[PDB]
Design a protein around this ligand. Structure first.
Ligand SMILES: OC[C@H]1O[C@@H](O[C@H]2[C@H](O)[C@@H](O)[C@H](O)O[C@@H]2CO)[C@H](O)[C@@H](O)[C@H]1O
Length: 277
């Protein structure tokens, strides 16, 4: 079966972190052999899911560019199912999908407050995993709609649980991470603890693992809400708590979710997905 040495060469990028202390790969441009992996997973006939939520004007502002870029760049050569969650189905753009892509659309109940928006999104993802996604795909990613694929975002990103390094903080010391710091919050992390600052705009894994991520995050949000507290960065704070306790088996570099407002440092060799404008 697939071994890490079959496809991952950390020595191609010695100026960055490529392996965690728990021996998870951090995937940077140049460290991965996509050809080897494409052939391995083709033989296995895997399908990959992608969930995206879009409410109100986010539909018109972002959803078409997201879908158009994902069709062009996400897991090319492998079956993909787009799970599109919107509040108004009559407003959603119908994009032409390429070979091995298809979609499903669901009408959801929008929530007014950011706390309740993220709360219901983690709950909704878990419900869909149990109802159907666990039957439909081998790997599932959950992404924010307000970003754009720029280049191939492929099977090198698959794993049991996949976290994204947040672009502004990947070089920072953990003491400075914008973790939730009040012990009243379920997302509490003490100063000095933590491995990375993960970005809630991309995460994934097998459907089983993603069910656990979302169920734990939802419980923590709920627990905070019953105590009249709102984590500093809402689901992202709880996600960071979760991945501290349940280490990801693979991490993606900021090449996979890059904010061009930062600039283009030497570390960022080829951008696969960028924050919207
Ligand atoms: O800190 C979590 C929070 O980061 C925001 O991104 C910020 C970044 O944290 C800040 O240091 C920099 O000065 O500006 C960035 C945006 O302009 C994200 O926008 C937010 O989603 C969280 O991930």
């Amino acid at each position: 079966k697939l071994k890490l040495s079959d496809w991952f060469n950390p020595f191609k990028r010695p100026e960055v972190v490529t392996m965690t202390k728990w021996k998870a790969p951090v995937v940077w441009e140049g460290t991965y052999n996509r050809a080897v992996l494409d052939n391995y997973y083709a033989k296995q006939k895997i399908t990959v899911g992608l969930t995206v939520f879009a409410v109100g004007r986010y539909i018109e502002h972002y959803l078409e560019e997201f879908l158009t870029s994902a069709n062009k760049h996400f897991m090319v050569g492998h079956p993909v199912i787009f799970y599109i969650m919107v509040d108004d189905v009559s407003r959603m753009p119908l994009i032409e999908l390429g070979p091995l892509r298809s979609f499903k659309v669901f009408k959801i109940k929008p929530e007014k407050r950011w706390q309740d928006i993220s709360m219901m999104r983690m709950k909704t993802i878990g419900e869909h995993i149990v109802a159907h996604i666990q039957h439909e795909v081998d790997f599932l990613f959950c992404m924010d709609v307000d970003q754009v694929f720029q280049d191939k975002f492929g099977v090198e990103t698959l794993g049991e649980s996949v976290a994204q390094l947040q672009a502004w903080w990947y070089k920072a010391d953990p003491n400075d991470f914008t973790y939730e710091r009040r012990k009243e919050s379920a997302a509490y992390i003490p100063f000095g603890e933590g491995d990375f600052y993960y970005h809630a705009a991309i995460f994934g894994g097998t459907p089983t693992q993603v069910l656990n991520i979302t169920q734990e995050c939802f419980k923590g949000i709920l627990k905070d809400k019953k105590n009249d507290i709102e984590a500093q960065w809402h689901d992202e704070s709880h996600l960071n708590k979760y991945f501290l306790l349940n280490k990801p088996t693979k991490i993606l570099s900021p090449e996979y979710c890059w904010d061009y407002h930062i600039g283009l440092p030497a570390d960022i060799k080829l951008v696969k997905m960028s924050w919207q404008t």
